Design a protein around this ligand. Structure first.
Ligand code: CD4
Ligand code: CD4
Ligand code: BCL
Ligand code: BCL
Ligand code: BCL
Ligand code: BPH
Ligand code: BPH
Ligand code: CRT
Ligand code: HEC
Ligand code: HEC
Ligand code: FE
Lengths: 69, 38, 101, 271, 335, 60, 298, 56, 55
């Protein structure tokens, strides 16, 4: 309770609401821009059908994502 | 600052700091069970 | 040339103590000369332009409303709105006599 | 040699580092601790620039070029033949630019002035630091910096601008150009305004502050203040450098495609 | 906390609006009475005062509005009179110059006639505005420095007319459009071989950066001595106070040389003017004296060497030869 | 001629004009605080300090 | 963001290619390559037992079946012989009701087109030729289909218009070059399209300090030029003459056959399919006597 | 302790929290940008299936 | 309650309505730009015919 005599309660609420609102928006938008949790488009899929990131992958021959240089 | 509440503040600061490190240690323990990095 | 026995490089008949390399400037860069010399190793001058001897007026439906030269690559290549794509060209026309009016 | 009113201002105090050891004047210049640091970095950097010229193919002033390392060295200190000399010169330039700003702060403190000049200069230093430090770090290689040559660094600007196929469509570049053009127009207006009042029509008395405000209200319907014009000039000139730093730091680290394609967002508004 | 940086004004005074110094009112007059903006007084002077209108101002406004109307109406017609498309595509719309094959002859109305008419009206408007600026300056017994500073920018603007006429085609003119005039800038640099190697272009770059440097330096200097009264520059010029002395001494100690309260404005004037003057000369020499600025720079030792990135065999040298661009195909062939 | 061309001539004419302009502005810069004071005596750089300039004030 | 940079020119020149790591990784992952069919190279040396085969007349029966399954999966999906054939009689070029099977005529012509690309245009597709897959991507309709629109459409640079140079080869102007700024804008638009069709920028093919120089440019520019020529041979002689074969739904508003551009093969990558090699395992598709010294069975 | 007579507890507490929040966000975003610990996409994989850097 | 002593109700009301209005527009516009919930175009489709993300 004594921490309110060290920090102004009005300033803390404004800082708290601003940080929580920003963090909530950042997390929601991070998940929406992903593949597994793009719930607006793929929310009706079950957990089995939801996309999963690639596991320990293999290699490729003569195919390169980057041009030579 | 009467130097006496500094002792009062120090006890709260030390416990809060050590308590935060213990909780973070449990979080690293949980993450190790999920996916070890060594 | 290289000494047959010792392997030492010989420069003007004198052996050199060390591994001789040919000195060059930064990444073998050579100062430029005359501007004509820029065209050695390049393709020769291009042929004269193909200019039509006559012009035929296209149909209005084949004519662009916009006269900007770069409109196709800067705007149309990123624009897919169907209304704008319709506005891109003039519309076909006829006469009242052709319609019977 | 001193100005006729200069002697009474040459007093001690105002330095950030050092005392009476570095509180003297060499000719007209004031030498502080950061004056000594400036000379060290200027001498070291210039001598290494001369060495880079001697390593290259020509002594022609326009054709001398000290180039940054290859991208394969990736934030390391390359061999001095292969671009490491460019990195050393960059450190000397950063030290000299920083020392110049801190030396200016010492001089204004001694004269009882504000701190505006060092911070205005910091806008130019920030733009340079973005070009050779911040953007290369974000892209992951010191080789993304520009070469040190009178016309060589123009070739870098051209090729980097065309890395996005039309650099005119950069939204931050468009704003920064407007700041530069408006600053030049405002400077011409301000310079003319003061000179026209101080050097009026022949045979007439020197005008007043009312004359300026009346003139610009007659021409444009609004007259910024005598302090307003100096505030605006500072804002336009420094904001030009700040928006320039933004425009180059978003190309590559944030936007990698062509700049014309960025305007999809405007064309896909729901309305 | 921090000192007062003289960046904004917190306490503003209000009095009766300044009507203005008495001037000759035979061919014009002042309109409005003078209002006050609270937001504008924070940064500068608050008065949105009366504006003078005379012969040259009225004629300039009429001609300029005619040019603006022509440009806007052609832009609107280019999207088929769609208001939604007109606003949505406004940066990309243009009023395009005539086709190249017409040279300097009159083009058709829908193929460059509107462009020439709008350019003519804009030029007349700019010249009339210059006359108005000159008259406004000499009505208050001021020197004519602003008219000639404006004439420098007018010279650069008029090179965009004179260079196409010297090369012999109105097709080379700058289109009226936000993105299209940037397209013209890029294509003009490309066509004439990298305008970076135009020496007067580099000179104008130097003067533009010098203008920015000078205004930053002067603004910071005046704001740093504004607590001593340095913003009243006329007083410090006719009667040098301690603010002018401190500015001089700061720059002498920093740089080894300095200006006065008056001559720093001469520096500013000349840098700003030389920007557009050197730029206009550089534009005038392009396509008339020099057709490839990179090759001119190679001629005069401006181009730094690089290692060759490719080499071509003789058959490759003959094959990689191309053709100069010609006319567009007016037929749709059937194969 | 062959090496000499119009752009070079214009550039050198501009250089001469710029140097003259710089001399004029440097002369104007020395209208306050001059001549300089030194132990060896009065000092003036190049360009030399100009003549005294007097303003005109409105009557009271 | 995470950015991948490839240096294409000399250090300090600013000649680099930039890629977004997430987009590039996603695009590389989403692209799948069909596994090559098991080779079939043993058949008796007898006469060809076929009725109306006019292109694949030098290919063994087992190889014939191999490549024809390959064509099915490349164009119309696995199996799906009915896209180009009467099932009851595969030697029929017409449907039972009388109307011709246009897909089969198009496929016969485009076998010849693929052979022509692989054999006479190795200066572009060097040792990495093309199959049906590179353009079709497993779907009947490829990408980058363009039709007659207007006179100034730059894609006609690939059909019937020649000449794109606008830069003077002198210091002083003459009558040898009277290109306008507008023609430079046209070339700029064409090259913007070319850059976007490969996911590269100007510096991939140019030193922008002088666009007209080939010595200062990367070798890819030469390759690019050959591409243009190859397009003018594919559009004029193979795709356009196919006009009277398509149904009306396949033509443009002017009633012309579909034509191809760079993005038809490249689809926004520096190499088609990131440089995957498939035609080496399909001898019926390359009109060469040997691919990499590997002889043609015949 | 006597250190709080030397440093203001408010200035230290604010600076320490600001440092920890920035540090925590940096670490979380470094792992998110990595391949092995991109937990939003591959978090359901077992430790054996998780990506591992090349032994080269 | 005592929150209105610490915060001015008039200032709170304006900030709350402004926040809610912006949030509702952002959500409505995000759904409009999607494929499953582009209701102005595909609102007459049944739930089984509506688009679904891949996999
Ligand atoms: C566009 C038109 C206009 C274009 C031109 C625009 C010009 C703009 C500026 C206008 C003013 C210029 C004139 C000026 O600055 O004069 C200063 C001095 C008179 O000074 P003073 O008034 O007598 O000095 C007052 C006061 O300092 C007295 O102190 P003291 O007499 O004890 O001096 C102690 C100093 C000097 O001792 C030294 O050892 C310094 C020597 C510096 C020069 C030699 C450098 C190379 C050797 C280095 C040392 C070696 C060991 C001894 O001691 C100090 O420490 C003073 C401060 C020095 C700097 C700070 C310390 C730096 C330490 C790190 C770096 C070390 C060097 C790498 O007078 C002269 O030097 C006369 C000649 C002036 C004209 C310039 C001639 C240049 C010739 C060479 C040209 C080369 C062109 C490429
Ligand atoms: C294409 C369109 C472009 C774009 C368009 C370009 C147009 C031309 C622009 C030319 C520069 C204008 C600069 C300026 O400040 O203008 C405002 C001023 C306003 O004057 P005002 O309103 O009539 O009255 C004000 C006046 O009382 C005070 O003026 P302020 O002092 O501010 O500046 C005017 C003069 C300085 O005045 C004095 O020095 C007079 C002091 C008492 C006499 C001095 C002692 C006796 C000397 C006797 C021998 C001397 C007798 C002259 O400043 C200037 O005129 C500018 C000087 C700096 C520029 C020249 C620097 C040297 C350049 C050559 C270097 C050669 C190589 C070494 O308007 C004027 O017309 C000023 C007078 C101009 C005189 C030169 C005219 C040259 C015309 C050349 C072409 C003629 C047809 C072929
Ligand atoms: C691949 C990486 C892992 C992961 C690995 C870790 C690890 C490992 C840790 C975190 C930690 C945290 N993670 Mg993480 N994290 C993941 C994904 C997430 C996601 C998400 C949307 O995916 C979110 C929102 C978070 C959020 C968080 C925060 C809660 C916290 C970091 C800030 C902090 O210090 O808070 C402070 C929050 C608190 C609850 C602190 C409470 C402190 C008080 C003072 C304790 C008092 C104790 C008592 C009073 C005194 C005892 C005294 C004596 C001991 C007797 N993680 C993924 C799955 N994360 C860190 C952490 O602190 O975890 C606990 C941490 O070490
Ligand atoms: C094909 C090329 C592209 C293009 C590509 C780029 C690229 C790429 C960049 C710009 C940048 C800029 N461009 Mg450009 N640009 C194009 C066309 C234009 C046009 C035009 C008319 O068409 C204009 C007006 C501009 C305008 C500008 C500015 C907004 C900006 C440069 C100023 C700056 O950064 O200052 C900032 C100032 C500095 C960096 C100077 C710092 C100086 C330091 C602090 C001190 C030096 C002291 C010195 C060593 C002392 C010497 C010794 C003493 C003299 C004794 N561009 C075309 C379309 N443009 C640049 C930018 O924004 O940079 C940040 C940039 O990198
Ligand atoms: C790919 C593009 C090319 C290039 C092509 C060009 C071309 C082409 C030109 C310039 C020009 C200029 N360029 Mg360059 N430029 C490039 C790269 C750069 C870079 C850089 C970052 O690399 C920079 C800093 C610059 C900077 C500059 C300026 C110094 C200069 C214009 C001065 C000026 O004030 O103009 C702005 C001032 C004016 C236009 C003056 C006239 C204003 C008139 C009077 C206004 C009337 C307004 C009216 C009343 C209101 C509107 C009415 C409605 C229209 C109806 N360029 C590259 C190499 N540049 C010009 C120049 O002089 O070149 C030598 C020029 O023409
Ligand atoms: C608001 C931003 C604008 C601005 C402002 C500005 N510049 C300023 C100031 C201000 C407010 C000063 O107070 C300061 C000054 O003291 O001026 C007299 C200065 C100044 N602006 C300068 C130049 C300058 N400013 C530029 C830019 C701008 N400055 C912006 C447009 C440019 C550009 C655009 O190119 C230049 C060239 C100097 C005259 C001066 C700062 C002097 C200084 O820092 O001196 C110390 C250093 C040296 C004497 C030399 C160091 C040499 C290095 C060690 C080695 C080589 C360095 C470099 C990498 C070489 C590269 C060359 C190639 C690119 C050709
Ligand atoms: C030293 C060189 C710099 C320079 C200098 C300079 N310019 C100047 C001056 C000077 C010294 C003036 O005295 C003069 C002036 O009066 O400035 C306030 C001018 C001026 N510089 C101008 C612009 C300008 N200067 C530019 C540049 C520069 N000016 C250089 C950088 C540029 C650029 C970068 O391109 C521009 C656009 C003008 C503000 C002014 C000259 C005014 C003029 O000639 O006006 C003619 C009148 C018209 C064209 C009529 C227009 C009518 C409206 C368009 C229609 C209105 C309809 C409706 C009522 C409103 C619609 C709103 C929309 C239009 C938004
Ligand atoms: C409802 O809205 C309406 C239509 C009513 C009004 C709205 C209008 C709008 C929205 C207008 C928008 C205008 C815009 C966006 C304009 C953009 C202008 C730009 C960016 C211009 C930039 C550069 C242009 C230049 C440099 C042009 C120079 C032209 C010159 C110098 C032309 C000279 C021509 C002459 C001297 C012609 C002489 C004629 C004769 C016959 C003598 O010679 C040929
Ligand atoms: C369209 C892309 C086709 C597909 C989907 C299939 N084939 Fe098929 N076929 C096609 C073409 C162009 C020809 C003629 C080739 C030439 O003239 O050189 C053929 C022909 C055949 C034959 C021989 C015809 C004859 O006997 O005269 C056979 C046996 C045949 N095609 C079989 C076949 C098989 C097994 C397929 C796999 C599903 C298949 N076809 C698909 C074009 C196409
Ligand atoms: C490789 C695919 C290239 C890309 C990427 C860019 N260009 Fe290019 N350029 C390329 C070729 C094969 C040619 C010649 C084509 C012909 O038919 O002759 C060109 C030519 C130009 C030119 C004209 C040069 C001249 O001498 O006049 C210009 C001005 C040009 N290219 C500019 C340019 C631009 C602006 C680009 C990015 C938008 C660009 N090029 C990319 C090959 C390639
Ligand atoms: Fe001023």
């Amino acid at each position: 309770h004594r921490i309110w005599l060290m920090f102004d309660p009005r300033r803390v609420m404004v800082a708290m609401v601003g940080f929580l609102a920003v963090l909530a928006l950042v997390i929601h938008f991070i998940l929406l821009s992903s593949q597994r949790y793009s719930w607006i488009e793929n929310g009706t899929l079950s957990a089995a059908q939801a996309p999963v990131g690639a596991s320990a992958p293999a290699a490729a021959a003569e195919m390169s994502p980057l041009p030579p240089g | 600052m009467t130097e006496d509440e500094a002792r009062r503040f120090h006890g709260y600061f030390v416990t809060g700091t050590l308590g935060y490190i213990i909780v973070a240690a449990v979080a690293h323990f949980l993450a190790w069970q999920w996916r070890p990095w060594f | 040339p290289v000494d047959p026995v010792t392997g030492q490089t010989i420069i003007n008949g004198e052996p050199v103590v060390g591994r001789v390399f040919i000195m060059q400037k930064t990444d073998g860069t050579v100062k430029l000369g005359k501007w004509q010399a820029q065209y050695d190793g390049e393709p020769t001058a291009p042929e004269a332009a193909n200019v039509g001897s006559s012009y035929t007026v296209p149909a209005p439906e084949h004519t662009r409303r916009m006269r900007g030269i770069m409109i196709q690559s800067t705007l149309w290549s990123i624009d897919g709105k169907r209304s704008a794509r319709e506005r891109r060209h003039y519309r076909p026309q006829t006469t009242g006599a052709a319609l019977g009016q | 040699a001193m100005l006729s009113f200069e002697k009474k201002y040459r007093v001690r105090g105002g330095t950030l580092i050092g005392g009476d050891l570095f509180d003297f004047w060499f000719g007209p210049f004031y030498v502080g601790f950061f004056g000594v640091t400036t000379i060290f970095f200027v001498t070291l950097g210039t001598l290494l620039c001369v060495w880079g010229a001697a390593m290259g193919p020509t002594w022609n002033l326009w054709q001398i070029s000290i180039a940054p390392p290859d991208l394969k060295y990736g934030l390391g200190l390359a061999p001095l033949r292969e671009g490491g000399l460019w990195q050393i010169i960059t450190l000397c330039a950063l030290g000299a630019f920083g020392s110049w700003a801190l030396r200016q702060a010492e001089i204004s403190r001694k004269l009882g002035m504000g701190m505006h000049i060092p911070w205005a200069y910091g806008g130019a230093v920030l733009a340079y630091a973005t070009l050779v430090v911040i953007r290369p770090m974000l892209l992951g290689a010191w080789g993304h910096g520009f070469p040190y040559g009178i016309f060589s660094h123009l070739d870098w600007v051209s090729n980097v601008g065309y890395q996005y196929l039309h650099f005119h469509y950069n939204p931050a570049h468009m704003i920064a150009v407007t700041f530069f053009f408006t600053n030049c127009l405002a400077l011409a207006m301000h310079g003319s305004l003061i000179l026209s009042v101080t050097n009026p029509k022949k045979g007439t008395p020197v005008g007043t502050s009312e004359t300026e405000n009346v003139f610009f209200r007659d021409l444009l319907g609004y007259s910024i203040g005598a302090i307003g014009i100096h505030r605006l000039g500072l804002f336009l000139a420094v904001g030009a450098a700040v928006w320039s730093a933004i425009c180059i730091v978003i190309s590559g680290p944030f936007w990698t495609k062509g700049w014309p394609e960025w305007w999809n967002w405007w064309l896909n508004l729901p309305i | 906390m921090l000192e007062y940086q003289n960046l904004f004004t917190r306490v503003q005074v209000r009095t009766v609006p300044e009507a203005g110094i008495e001037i000759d009112e035979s061919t014009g007059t002042r309109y409005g009475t003078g209002t006050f903006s609270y937001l504008a007084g924070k940064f500068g002077d608050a008065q949105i005062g009366p504006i003078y209108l005379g012969w040259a101002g009225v004629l300039s406004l009429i001609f300029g509005f005619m040019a603006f109307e022509i440009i806007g109406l052609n832009m609107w017609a280019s999207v088929g009179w769609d208001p939604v498309e007109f606003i949505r595509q406004l940066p990309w719309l243009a009023l395009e110059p005539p086709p190249p094959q017409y040279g300097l002859r009159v083009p058709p109305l829908a193929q460059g006639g509107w462009y020439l008419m709008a350019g003519f009206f804009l030029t007349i408007s700019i010249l009339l505005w210059w006359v108005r600026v000159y008259r406004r300056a000499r009505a208050l017994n001021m020197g004519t420095h602003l008219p000639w500073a404006f004439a420098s920018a007018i010279f650069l603007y008029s090179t965009f007319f004179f260079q196409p006429l010297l090369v012999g085609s109105w097709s080379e003119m700058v289109p009226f459009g936000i993105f299209p005039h940037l397209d013209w800038t890029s294509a003009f640099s490309i066509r004439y071989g990298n305008l970076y190697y135009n020496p007067f272009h580099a000179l104008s770059i130097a003067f533009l950066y010098g203008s920015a440097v000078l205004f930053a330096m002067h603004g910071a200097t005046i704001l740093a001595v504004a607590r001593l009264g340095g913003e009243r520059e006329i007083e410090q010029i006719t009667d040098r106070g301690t603010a002018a002395e401190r500015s001089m001494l700061f720059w002498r100690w920093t740089m080894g040389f300095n200006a006065t309260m008056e001559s720093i404005h001469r520096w500013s004037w000349w840098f700003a003017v030389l920007t557009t003057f050197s730029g206009g000369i550089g534009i005038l020499l392009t396509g008339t004296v020099v057709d490839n600025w990179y090759l001119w720079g190679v001629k005069h030792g401006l181009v730094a060497p690089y290692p060759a990135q490719n080499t071509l065999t003789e058959e490759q040298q003959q094959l990689l030869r191309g053709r100069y661009q010609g006319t567009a195909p007016d037929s749709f062939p059937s194969y | 001629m062959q090496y000499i061309d119009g752009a070079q001539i214009a550039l050198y004419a501009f250089w001469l004009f710029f140097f003259g302009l710089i001399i004029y502005i440097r002369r104007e810069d020395k209208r306050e605080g001059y001549p300089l004071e030194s132990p060896q005596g009065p000092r003036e750089g190049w360009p030399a300090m100009p003549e005294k300039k007097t303003y005109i004030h409105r009557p009271t | 963001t995470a950015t991948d940079s490839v240096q294409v020119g000399y250090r300090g020149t600013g000649m680099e290619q930039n890629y977004d790591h997430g987009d590039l990784k996603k695009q590389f992952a989403q692209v799948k390559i069909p596994t090559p069919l098991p080779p079939a190279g043993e058949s008796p040396p007898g006469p060809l037992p076929w009725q109306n085969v006019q292109v694949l007349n030098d290919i063994s029966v087992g190889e014939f079946n191999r490549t024809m399954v390959a064509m099915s999966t490349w164009v119309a999906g696995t199996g799906n012989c009915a896209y180009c054939h009467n099932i009851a009689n595969l030697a029929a070029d017409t449907l039972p009701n009388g109307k011709p099977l246009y897909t089969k005529l198009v496929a016969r012509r485009m076998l010849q087109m693929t052979r022509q690309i692989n054999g006479q245009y190795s200066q572009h597709v060097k040792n990495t030729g093309v199959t049906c897959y590179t353009c079709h991507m497993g779907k009947p309709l490829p990408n980058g289909l363009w039709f007659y629109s207007s006179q100034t459409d730059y894609l006609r640079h690939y059909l019937d218009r020649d000449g794109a140079r606008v830069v003077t080869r002198d210091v002083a102007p003459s009558n040898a070059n009277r290109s306008s700024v507008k023609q430079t804008e046209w070339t700029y638009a064409l090259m913007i399209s070319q850059s976007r069709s490969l996911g590269v920028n100007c510096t991939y093919c140019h030193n922008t300090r002088q666009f007209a120089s080939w010595k200062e440019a990367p070798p890819a520019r030469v390759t690019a030029y050959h591409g243009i020529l190859m397009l003018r041979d594919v559009n004029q002689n193979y795709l356009s003459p196919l006009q009277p074969v398509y149904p009306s739904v396949r033509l443009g508003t002017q009633g012309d056959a579909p034509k191809a551009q760079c993005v038809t093969c490249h689809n926004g990558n520096y190499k088609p399919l990131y440089g995957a090699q498939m035609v080496k395992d399909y001898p019926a598709l390359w009109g060469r006597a040997d691919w990499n010294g590997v002889p043609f069975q015949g």
